[PDB]
Amino acid sequence: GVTLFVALYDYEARTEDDLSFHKGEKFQIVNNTEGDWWLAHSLTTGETGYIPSNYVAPVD
Amino acid sequence: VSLARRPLPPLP
């Protein structure tokens, strides 16, 4: 299977390249290897964009 | 710096 990630805090994006999200939102990772911001897909909005890795945690 | 490598936001 896979490891999903969960938002720990709300976040308001400043660019459309980034997702805005709310605490408890779940994401699939598209790319987590290029840097501290991860390209992700929100299972709530269906949108794809970057998320800040310090705002999420893996499902555990 | 690419989008992936921007500074992270501070924790709330």
Side-chain angles (χ1 to χ4, degrees), chain A residues 2-27:
Chain A
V2 304
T3 301
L4 302 180
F5 285 77
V6 185
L8 300 176
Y9 328 104
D10 298 343
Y11 183 68
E12 288 165 20
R14 304 291 295 272
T15 176
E16 299 173 0
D17 274 313
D18 295 339
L19 300 182
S20 296
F21 53 84
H22 294 83
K23 177 173 188 164
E25 197 149 337
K26 294 181 194 170
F27 306 91

Side-chain angles (χ1 to χ4, degrees), chain A residues 9 17-18 34-37 50 52 54-55, chain B residues 2-12:
Chain A
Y9 328 104
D17 274 313
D18 295 339
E34 293 186 342
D36 283 350
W37 293 75
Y50 281 95
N54 61 333
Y55 276 53
Chain B
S2 58
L3 287 167
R5 297 193 57 252
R6 290 169 296 159
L8 289 171
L11 295 173

